[PDB]
Amino acid sequence: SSAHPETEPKWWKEATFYQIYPASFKDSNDDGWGDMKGIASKLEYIKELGADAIWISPFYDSPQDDMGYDIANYEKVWPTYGTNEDCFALIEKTHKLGMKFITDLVINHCSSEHEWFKESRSSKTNPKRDWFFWRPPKGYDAEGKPIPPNNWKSYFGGSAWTFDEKTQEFYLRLFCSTQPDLNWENEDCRKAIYESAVGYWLDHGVDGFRIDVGSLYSKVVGLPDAPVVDKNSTWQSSDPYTLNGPRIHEFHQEMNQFIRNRVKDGREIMTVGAMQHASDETKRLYTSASRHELSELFNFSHTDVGTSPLFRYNLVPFELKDWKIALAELFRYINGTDCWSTIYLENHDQPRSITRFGDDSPKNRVISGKLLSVLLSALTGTLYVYQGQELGQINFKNWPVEKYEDVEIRNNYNAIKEEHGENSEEMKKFLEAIALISRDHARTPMQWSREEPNAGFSGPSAKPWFYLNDSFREGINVEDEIKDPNSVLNFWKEALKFRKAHKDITVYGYDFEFIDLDNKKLFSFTKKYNNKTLFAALNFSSDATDFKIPNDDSSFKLEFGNYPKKEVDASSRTLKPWEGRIYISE
């Protein structure tokens, strides 16, 4: 383990994080929106699951045009969630339970309702004009409408610019129309961002930050028209000019130094960057401890599988190997370095992992949910569990498009309508995809009980902010799963206990090697830690599947799996349907 600097322990390397989506976790006052008192009341549940830390999605004052990711004030809790004091009390309660607390740092962009933008947009001459990206129209079209400065596509569809009538210029918004991008080229802007979004929260005791689209802060000068890579789209991905831009490391080093100098009590701060995509070299530049940038990052290749590179909402075929390789992108690069990795399958931007990567049928949803838990329990990196993942939550079914809340759905729908027609092949493909891929599959209220109609998320008379998934009626809820010894919840409790007990090789294991990489059913690998060897054999299929242990002898003992502990023949070399096994040799 000496030629493996990545094995140096840190609280944040071996912490299991639980991600809370505040709108959808727990309502304490029957207004249909989750809130901080709700979260506080459920911290014991999170601790009992086995979590070491929580990440709460944005709870700051926000119009909710992107459900919190459009922030109007970094220093004020959205009143519907509570007061600032409620938040400080929540941080303290988390701490007093022996858990760490990270907050979501959303500083590529802010709300157009933020005072910075209200000032910026007020004239062309004000001190904050250049805190955002303002450009004149490229020209005017044949109908007299202003043409945006370039061809860039919003992450939510359509143009990445919005026209301001008052000042007669467009402003850049990679996200929704009310999320203007902050101009990191402006040093005064960067310093104000650090003070408000970072310093305030450090002063109030956070243990770290999850950094929203942290790879987007550096725009290539001139904001040039992007390559026309999609021949059936008006607008084009800005990635070459916005993703991992030339100043991105400079900016992350500066922010890291700010954090180091602002902390008052010497505590260890974790940063996890949602960096989206990066070469292995770029990943190392971000997460090498000696670089003083990020602690770790999320890379999205494993959650991209089965979606077109040109458009997330066009489905494409994939095979198990594609997912194996994409998952391994998270962690293989750290081998023999001072870098660190993340491990996750779900977040508030993703559909449910059982639906995507298991089998959500009534027959297989439990066993395949447990299989995914076996996989994640054994992988190197900081593990994240998303609210409801531990219950084996699945995608919702048969929802009409108008039922979806997500601005990502609404804006993409409207762009397709405009470009291709509502009754088009392009629309049909989109509607097919949303049923599998929409962020909204993550966002239906948390299911605490079988109680009609709100599943214990709120009282029975409340109208939830977003519809319940019918799955609560099918036993996917906290109360029913606690009482079922065979539940996905009780299994996740076991998986986290197993991971912690064997943390040297589960959390810090190295020299990851695939076994039978091409296999369309078997996901198998080994890892090392000094004298120890971990071997995984995981059957992602309803068919029985054979496996071999490389250098198989007598030392390989079965330490964890999803089939009944007393019924499994450890010497057998065929996995049952959806069976997973972790063997450890010493």
Ligand SMILES: OC[C@H]1O[C@H](O)[C@H](O)[C@@H](O)[C@@H]1O
């Ligand atoms: O902040 C803009 C977007 O950034 C990331 O994708 C966030 O995780 C997502 O929820 C948000 O819509």
Ligand SMILES: [Ca+2]
């Ligand atoms: Ca509420």
